[PDB]
């Protein structure tokens, strides 16, 4: 599914990336936050956590994650927590390890975002 969207259509990868950029900004702009680069801006887990609350209708208490992570380990914990929120909302366990997102593996990042897009396209 995500093998063809990634590998053998390089200009179509850019189509999905522009679509995902648009979708995450629909929501994160409400917190005065802007995403211009999917390669790095979700790696520390913060925007994934904030995005899940925007998409599923809750606030995440700031003691539940690291709003300003100061280590690789805290970024992994943020991403792992965001994955838990993902499963809370009905998505199946995400395929990538938490570390894959923190290490800016674009395929791991793009898969997680695309699954959020597939589910929440129409949330306003």
């Amino acid at each position: 599914a995500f093998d063809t969207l990634f590998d053998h259509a390089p200009d179509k990868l850019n189509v999905v990336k522009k679509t995902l950029i648009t979708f995450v900004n629909k929501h994160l702009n409400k917190l005065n936050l802007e995403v211009t680069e999917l390669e790095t801006q979700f790696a520390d887990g913060v925007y994934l956590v904030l995005l899940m609350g925007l998409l599923e209708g809750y606030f995440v208490p700031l003691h539940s994650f690291f709003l300003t992570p100061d280590s690789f380990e805290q970024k992994v914990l943020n991403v792992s927590f965001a994955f838990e929120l993902m499963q809370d909302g009905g998505l199946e366990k995400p395929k990538p390890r938490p570390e894959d997102i923190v290490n800016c593996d674009l395929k791991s990042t793009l898969r997680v975002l695309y699954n959020l897009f597939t589910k929440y396209r129409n949330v306003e």
Partner: protein
């Protein structure tokens, strides 16, 4: 040889489903001659540990000794029940939120609103005499119920159990700024509850949902980090303004206890 067996799930008569959401399903039903509401809880990764915890936490909610507290009548232990389940009496008017914001038949007058405030203050004062405090009750207009004689009652069925995700807050507009940011162990619970009460006063004064134009995530982040506060309404009495301001003090330590605002609200009664 358990101290409680709980309510037998097989004795519940499920009549009509009222709601379903992330937390479970609500049904109107009947049990042992009572008109009841049943909440069937939705829990991911249910376990024997969580089930043990549910069964230790539910008995604390069976509070029959105060008119402004609505007890859990009982709970169905799972196993043997299919899911962990709570039962309470059916409150004909529904929640305070329903009565204030979804009331299609009548608008409660301000004498009734002041009585609601007194009712809630008395129930919360009583709850704060209990040792230890009932873990994780968030005071807001959805967690106060209006009984057949219009008495407002704190809903013990709306507590959050230990296994219900602490990382997802669904009514942040009523939560004190410090409680949006700090673990409950690092906050004074009665001061945090008094902030919630102040927002209830605001809601009773304006007949508006606080921050209705914002998503829950926007509310929590702006209240915690950008100083967003309810706008004190124009043209209310100085006495109501003063009470709202002291209950919503930025310093938790300067907020009054519930038992100190009960006599204030008593003198405000007109009925």
């Amino acid at each position: 040889m358990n101290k409680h067996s709980g309510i037998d799930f097989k004795q519940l008569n499920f009549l009509t489903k009222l709601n379903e959401n992330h937390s479970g399903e609500l049904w109107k039903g009947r049990w042992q001659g009572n008109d009841i509401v049943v909440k069937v809880l939705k829990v991911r990764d249910w376990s024997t540990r969580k089930s043990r915890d549910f069964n230790e936490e539910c008995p604390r909610l069976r509070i029959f000794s105060h008119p402004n507290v609505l007890p859990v009548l009982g709970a169905c232990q799972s196993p043997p029940a299919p899911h962990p389940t709570l039962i309470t009496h059916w409150m004909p008017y529904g929640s305070l939120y329903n009565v204030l914001h979804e009331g299609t038949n009548f608008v409660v007058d301000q004498s009734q609103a002041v009585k609601f405030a007194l009712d809630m203050a008395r129930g919360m004062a009583f709850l704060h005499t209990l040792e230890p405090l009932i873990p994780r009750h968030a005071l807001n207009s959805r967690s106060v119920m209006i009984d057949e004689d219009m008495t407002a009652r704190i809903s013990m069925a709306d507590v959050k159990f230990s296994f219900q995700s602490p990382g997802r807050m669904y009514a942040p507009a009523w939560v004190a700024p410090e409680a949006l940011q700090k673990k409950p162990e690092d906050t004074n619970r009665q001061s945090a509850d008094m902030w919630s009460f102040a927002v209830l006063l605001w809601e009773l004064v304006t007949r508006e949902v606080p921050f209705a134009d914002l998503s829950n995530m926007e509310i929590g982040m702006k209240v915690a980090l950008e100083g967003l506060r309810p706008t004190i309404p124009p043209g209310i009495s100085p006495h109501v303004s003063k009470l709202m301001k002291i209950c919503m003090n930025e310093d938790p330590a300067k907020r009054p206890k519930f038992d100190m605002i009960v006599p204030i609200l008593e003198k405000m009664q007109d009925k």
